[PDB]
A paper describes a structure:
Multidrug resistance-associated protein 2 (MRP2) is an ATP-powered exporter important for maintaining liver homeostasis and a potential contributor to chemotherapeutic resistance. Using cryogenic electron microscopy (cryo-EM), we determine the structures of human MRP2 in three conformational states: an autoinhibited state, a substrate-bound pre-translocation state, and an ATP-bound post-translocation state.
To understand how substrate is recognized by MRP2 and the effect of substrate binding on the autoinhibitory R domain, we determined the cryo-EM structure of WT MRP2 in the presence of leukotriene C4 (LTC4), a pro-inflammatory signaling molecule that is transported by multiple MRP transporters. The cryo-EM map, refined to an overall resolution of 2.75 Å, shows no density for the R domain, indicating that the R domain is flexible in this conformation. These results suggest that only at sufficiently high concentrations can the substrate displace the R domain to be transported. In MRP2, LTC4 is largely stabilized by hydrogen bonds between the GSH moiety and residues K329, Q447, R1205, and R1257. Despite the high resolution of the cryo-EM map and clear density for the GSH moiety, density for the lipid tail is mostly absent except for a short portion stabilized by van der Waals interactions with W1254. In MRP2, the corresponding residue to Y440 is, in fact, a phenylalanine (F437), mirroring the Y440F variant of MRP1.
Residue numbers in the entry: 1 to 262, 305 to 863, 962 to 1538
The structure:
Amino acid sequence: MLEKFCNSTFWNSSFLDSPEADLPLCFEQTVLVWIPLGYLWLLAPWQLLHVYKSRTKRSSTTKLYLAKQVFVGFLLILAAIELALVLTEDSGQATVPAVRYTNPSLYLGTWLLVLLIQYSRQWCVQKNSWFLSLFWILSILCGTFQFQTLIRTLLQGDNSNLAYSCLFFISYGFQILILIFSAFSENNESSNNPSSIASFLSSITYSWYDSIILKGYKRPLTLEDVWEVDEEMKTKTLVSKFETHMKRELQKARRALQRRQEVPKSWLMKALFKTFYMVLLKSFLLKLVNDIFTFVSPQLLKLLISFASDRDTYLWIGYLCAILLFTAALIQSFCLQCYFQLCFKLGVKVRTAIMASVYKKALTLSNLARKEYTVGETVNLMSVDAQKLMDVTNFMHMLWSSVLQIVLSIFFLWRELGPSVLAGVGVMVLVIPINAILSTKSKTIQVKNMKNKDKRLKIMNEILSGIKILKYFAWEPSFRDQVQNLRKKELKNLLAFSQLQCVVIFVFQLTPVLVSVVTFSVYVLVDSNNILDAQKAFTSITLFNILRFPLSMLPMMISSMLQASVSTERLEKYLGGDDLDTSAIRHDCNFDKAMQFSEASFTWEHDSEATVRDVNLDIMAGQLVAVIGPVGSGKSSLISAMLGEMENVHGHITIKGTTAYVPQQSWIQNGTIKDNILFGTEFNEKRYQQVLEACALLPDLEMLPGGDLAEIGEKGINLSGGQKQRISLARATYQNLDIYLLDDPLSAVDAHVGKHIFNKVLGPNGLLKGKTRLLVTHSMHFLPQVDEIVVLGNGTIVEKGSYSALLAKKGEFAKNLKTFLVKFSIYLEYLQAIGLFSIFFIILAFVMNSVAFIGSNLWLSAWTSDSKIFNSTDYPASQRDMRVGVYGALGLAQGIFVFIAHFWSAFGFVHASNILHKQLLNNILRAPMRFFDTTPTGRIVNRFAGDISTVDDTLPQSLRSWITCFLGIISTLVMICMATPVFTIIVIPLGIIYVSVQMFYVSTSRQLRRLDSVTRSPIYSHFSETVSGLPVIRAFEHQQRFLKHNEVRIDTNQKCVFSWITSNRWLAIRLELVGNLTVFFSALMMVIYRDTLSGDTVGFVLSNALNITQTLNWLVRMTSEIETNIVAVERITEYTKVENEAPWVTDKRPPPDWPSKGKIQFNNYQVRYRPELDLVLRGITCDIGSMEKIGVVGRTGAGKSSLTNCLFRILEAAGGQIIIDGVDIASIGLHDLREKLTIIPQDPILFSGSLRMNLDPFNNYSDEEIWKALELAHLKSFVASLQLGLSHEVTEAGGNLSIGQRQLLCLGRALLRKSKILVLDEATAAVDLETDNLIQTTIQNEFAHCTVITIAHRLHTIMDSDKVMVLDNGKIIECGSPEELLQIPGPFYFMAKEAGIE
Ligand SMILES: CC(C)CCC[C@@H](C)[C@H]1CC[C@H]2[C@@H]3CC=C4C[C@@H](O)CC[C@]4(C)[C@H]3CC[C@]12C
Ligand SMILES: CC(C)CCC[C@@H](C)[C@H]1CC[C@H]2[C@@H]3CC=C4C[C@@H](O)CC[C@]4(C)[C@H]3CC[C@]12C
Ligand SMILES: CC(C)CCC[C@@H](C)[C@H]1CC[C@H]2[C@@H]3CC=C4C[C@@H](O)CC[C@]4(C)[C@H]3CC[C@]12C
Ligand SMILES: CC(C)CCC[C@@H](C)[C@H]1CC[C@H]2[C@@H]3CC=C4C[C@@H](O)CC[C@]4(C)[C@H]3CC[C@]12C
Ligand SMILES: CC(C)CCC[C@@H](C)[C@H]1CC[C@H]2[C@@H]3CC=C4C[C@@H](O)CC[C@]4(C)[C@H]3CC[C@]12C
């Protein structure tokens, strides 16, 4: 038919079989018009209805809107002129062809539709969308054929359609110009994020990010510069979608588990899939288009090898293949980078949905379920298992895609080499099992090794917390050796893991070499009719390069799916657990009684006895009541049951209004002290200042170094147990609730501040007078002031009444009350730690691999050329066997050098990991005490934890990957320039683009990786903090505040990760385009020089210029990764080079048994705590008698504490000297001093481990010497009770031992040492007077033969010494015997008068 639509031939293949080919005009004017117009009309009705059903308001008019609309107006006018010239010129005189009329008539209809859809677009947020952008591209790429046909016909000299040709040329020019205007963003000027307003072309090329790239280059960037994340991706948006499917599938699985057997599992993957399925479909279609286009380039490669293998194939075929190579690679790059945007965004959305669901569950999980986990083990559920589901979600499409790429590669190989490909398949089926075994083994070693790290870190945290005691006792060598041993076993595992990883990477790298050496050898040896040529060889090498990624990726997805299955069981177990039962505690307000117990019973364990048995009491408003009894009788369980933190056995409790709670064990948040007091409430100056005074807190705030704004918390300044207790009561009293529950808060503070706090805060004269207050006490001191008292016996109420009524009744209380009687030198530091001798041979082995690789490609280029000299009958068998032999030899040679390079490097990186730790630890233990006072302990721990882990884990594999990519690029550029040296002129321009794109990327990505790394840890420390605080958070009803604070943290991290993900999608567009241009210009050189080239050279060049493109990208990715991770070596190096104390042992040795008398002597002494300060102590001058007993005293701030520090040389002397037994303590080695003096520390600390190593970590004393030390300490009767005697184990900080035996055990340690000189610095805190008395008599009984110096804050502790020493302005004022010092009125007498002592 079309022959009489156009009066000319529609198709004739004899137009293409010539040097000057063109298409028939009938084909151009029909099919190449109907393609772009058919795309427009089939979809425009839907695109119009989509806007009509989603419009809100019009945008402003713009210059670009005018400019687009007027040029489509010219397209409409030209279509009218074109129809007018056909309709007037025909004059009815001849039968003009139909096409001459239909085509203009179609264009008139289309330009009216284009004006209409452009007008409709002014309601949308994104103006220039995909729909019109692909119409202009399709129109311009179809019109290009007719453009060259018309201009070539006109240039040949025919003018028969000149006017029509001009109307076409103008219409083609204006479409290119409309496409250029259609590229710009045409902003709404919304400051939120450019990605919502960006055009289709800017979106696919990520050209809306250049605004951050140009910002992060010229100056540092910060969290205010990073765009806020999209509303579809906010934590509230994701959790409210996910929870809808979670509840549905969890309830279904619960019902299925209840239908069986007559916890639920296999529901979390169903809930995730149903939440996100639409993102999976969009990702699948993009990946499938890439997996089609990846097999186009090998077919276009074969055509170019054929075009070089004869010289009468038409010249236009060569240029057309070069254009199609560039075009196919460009379309593939845009699809691939979109697929990655969707996949890496989905992995972040899955993490966010799990982390926020785990957090919200923790606030409501039952007590029986919660006891099954440690705090660190619940934090690992958010830190490890949520991250494992992200790491799998990023790559899961590789499970189907890798199989498809393998099957298509085997098909396109059978087409080139027939049945011989089965010899290559025999290699591919052997390597996949081996990689899955080595990958699951190395993952198993990595998980087992994780336990050793935790043990080392826990010991370190106790070493750095106890460092003052390690210095006093000279114990640093014992704790140094203890850490080193655990490191050795950790390094042994690290070497085995590193060796398994190096053989896995070797097999991934060599498999294309092995499979090609096997396949070409079998093909040539099996049948003498088989002869190898450039088309078969260099095409097959391209398919062997396509196979490398899917063959290595499949084993790693299999071993990762086996890991994520364990993480899924842990998440399903936790999220499926029972919610807390509220039904036994009732909040009926207006109950005319604040609290009411109805025969109730409760327990800590539903299998066990009731801990608070039948109890029946009730209490009215504004009533202060006290709870008392013997130890373990039930006291703190009564408050815990009232809060609902226990299992009900019987009855119920009723409560009226709001509650405040103070626990026996204090909970404190990271923040300022002011933030902990205000606890999310608004500030109000008068009330705030009144609370700080009432809680006796101002005397602490006067001496904390930050004042009221001091950084308290685990990552901040440390506070005493009495300070943490005051702060806890100060928080509770600021909130102003109805009911106060107190779990014996006075138990951690002295009786004088206790009396002050009782009168100010909670007594019938204090702040809380209008509030009902239930007070647990172990002390009797305040009972006379209470409204009503109850005694508990064996979990139930025994007696009740006022204080006087209990004594008048003569109950058991009346007898019991008788108890009241980037710089380059950092890279060089790391290379010297590996050692420069190994760097040389590792680099030499990597270079020899590159030379053997080049040699094997040159040999194959020679081998295929034999096919033009010989034939299937005449090829010599000696030459066949010689060609096969040395190709196998060059295949083996590069296998040997790659194995030597990888396997040697594993010993090099493990050697550096050892040296850096060994030098850090040895410096830190020698640091002076100023370092530990000025530096917060969490900072030092991070260097020993995260940094050491960075240096020994990721760092090594980044350096290996970089040198592998670098030599791959250099090897490839050498082979191209060796084949056609004119290409060296094209290398300079592309090299200037490449180094510029690297410079702009690496300046930004390094900052986003830092900004991610600093903002992630606050999520896990806040989760650890809230899980530790649950009964406090519930008692105040604060759950909604805490949920919002978690959402703010997660959203703040989420934007740093997503903008870093975007930053590497931008990079890839530029570097894949630079890569694509190397193959396009390389292909063109070999078309223009076809007279002096062969199919062998063209195959040799294009084959490895096709694999360059992903290597060009990965070299820049690794450069950013190394520049990020190398900072770990800087931080370690910083502390490795901080200052040290005086030598522990000097040649000047003290004589044998040196402290023989104890003649301590001071001359004009002077000290300051830091070079920045004036002197704390000045001009001290004294002589101390052999075995003399001394007290030191002075007005608070006298500086007394300087003596105990400087006598051990913790502080170095500013002037004067000190002597002991004729030796000056400044000349002797620092351990030879410390080890001879004996000190009892002010505050007891124990190290987690045996009773044996807590008394003697050097294992130097004998078993009976320790038993008599516990006898003299009076602990024998306790230690003999434990199943293990001296081998029994203490937990963290000794927490399984109560405070009485802790203080006593620290006295027992000193008894074993038993030296001639003893220091005592009495503490100013609460103590059990029985333990105080038995310690004080033991001091007088057992150290009778020692010289003794005592420091105390009360004169009744001093008053029986041989001498008293009084100083105030850091200078001596008086000294004498303690009666004579009172006998004449003077400094000490006035004090003793103020103390009531004299
Ligand atoms: C796949 C396309 C887009 C690019 C590859 C080049 C194409 C256009 C080339 C490669 C081989 C060519 C064919 C080779 C031989 C003949 C036989 C002759 O009697 C008619 C032309 C015909 C049938 C050619 C048509 C054009 C052709 C198919
Ligand atoms: C890519 C778009 C924008 C433009 C493409 C235009 C192409 C197809 C045009 C531009 C210049 C044209 C060439 C100009 C001159 C000659 C010389 C003549 O003896 C044969 C045709 C030939 C060789 C033309 C072939 C077609 C041609 C290459
Ligand atoms: C497909 C799109 C993207 C590009 C199309 C390019 C076409 C129009 C180009 C590419 C190669 C060109 C040919 C290259 C060489 C010759 C030989 C010369 O003696 C006459 C022109 C002729 C035959 C050209 C005609 C136009 C041509 C076929
Ligand atoms: C047209 C767009 C899409 C791509 C650009 C292709 C370029 C590189 C192609 C298209 C047309 C080609 C020309 C067409 C015709 C001839 C005449 C011939 O005796 C020498 C080569 C020469 C001079 C070609 C050189 C390369 C050329 C200019
Ligand atoms: C396998 C190992 C032991 C071999 C050692 C490789 C050495 C020579 C390589 C590995 C990583 C490299 C560094 C990686 C990144 C940068 C930042 C860039 O702006 C300048 C070059 C510089 C500083 C490189 C210098 C050379 C380097 C240190």
